[PDB]
Amino acid sequence: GSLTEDGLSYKEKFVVRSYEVGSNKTATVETIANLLQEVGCNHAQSVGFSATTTTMRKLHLIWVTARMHIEIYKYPAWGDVVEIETWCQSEGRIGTRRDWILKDSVTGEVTGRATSKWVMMNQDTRRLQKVSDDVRDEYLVFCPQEPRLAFPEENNRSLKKIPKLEDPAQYSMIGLKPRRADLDMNQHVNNVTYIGWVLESIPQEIVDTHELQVITLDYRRECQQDDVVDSLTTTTSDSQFLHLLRLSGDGQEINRGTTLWRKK
Amino acid sequence: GSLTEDGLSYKEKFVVRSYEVGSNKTATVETIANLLQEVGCNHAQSVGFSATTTTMRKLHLIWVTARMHIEIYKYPAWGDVVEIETWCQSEGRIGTRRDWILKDSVTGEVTGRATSKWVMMNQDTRRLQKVSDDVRDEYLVFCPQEPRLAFPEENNRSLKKIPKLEDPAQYSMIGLKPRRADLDMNQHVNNVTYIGWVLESIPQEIVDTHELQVITLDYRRECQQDDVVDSLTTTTSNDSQFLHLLRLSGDGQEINRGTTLWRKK
Ligand SMILES: O=C(O)c1ccc(O)c(Cl)c1
């Protein structure tokens, strides 16, 4: 991987692995989400991050994911090479955004795109915050100053508000628990694990006859290492679904989302 | 990755990823096990498999894992490059073996080694069998003819018989279930998922003060997609050793047994 000529975006190529593909012999959406996080981390390292800036370390602040939105046109097959370009942009004091574009390395065609929203949090208290001028100033040195959007269109799916699923859910997968492989180096549940848990309650017949085209996921609260989660899904329709992840006991919401599937 | 000059082994380099490392900022043993399977798959593809041979496809036969044995001296850090060399060898009619050697790409030092035993099974009936002469002759053209062992030693750990853990277990993790990401392209539970499940019942205090040096795992029966597993561990021992058992949550049918050896950090 390398920063591009202008130093305002980063590109990396990945060869799809045998264990990264599903029943269709193409990369799963969880594999795609892991590659997005990997190229994001390599970009952060290339421009001087630990991921935190110097002012953030002084104030004990961290970036936390608020939303992930991914649209896939074609999933790469086992052995194929996918090139992913990523960049960040400040969104004033709301937070920051990281966008991605995925391409078939051979044809150069766009095979997918993604966008994510990040908010500032005090690492100790876990209290959300607005971004200060100091953090925005140092962030502006590695971001394009004119807007660059993976999802440019006004009123596009990536910004749509997601409603809360009402009981009874049409489908459910209960008692989901993270294992040590689901945790990151800081013992926090990996963001991709929540995508896997959401998809667990999609019925097998849909997975057998459709391919996932779009997923939008809000992250409200973290699942701790000793927590247990229930995954709930209801058909809202192409097939569309509404999703809810909540703690198995008291029902505290941890994520809500929507998926759109197209028939094979 | 590429076959070596003589065409009897395969090498591949991997850059360790951010999500592949654990609390020590080095690759987990599950990451190592996934890289071993990946270089094994790339080797099989480079020598014509599709991982069945022509005679196996005609007779509806497949290779299934019987045992995995891994020893790690040093785990690669995030961003490091690890080079893995792999090769296969026939073991007469018993089955086949795949061995691996892991090296630090910069120093060229050996940082780990692994060996696995595979047995032939009919894909439909699931009945184990001996290797036929046609299959033995077919894969002999891609294997070294003089023995090449990752674990050459006289009475080495890789071949040690593993006993069955007796109840009550000292530690347990109950109700483990595979999710869709734990399945391979044929909807079978990935071999690395069982390693993760074994390790789940090791207490956190051991994980915080020790590093895993050796794991030996026998595979007896598969966990199906709708099965639920219980992971059981008992301390058998500056080094800590454990005995492991994975069994179905309901009737207690054994699916795996193993041992781990941990050295203090
Ligand atoms: O292999 C598959 O089809 C597969 C894998 C993961 C996942 O979450 C889904 Cl919905 C399907």
Ligand SMILES: O=C(O)c1ccc(O)c(Cl)c1
């Ligand atoms: O992050 C770790 O320390 C880690 C990860 C996986 C695993 O199985 C164990 Cl025992 C530890």
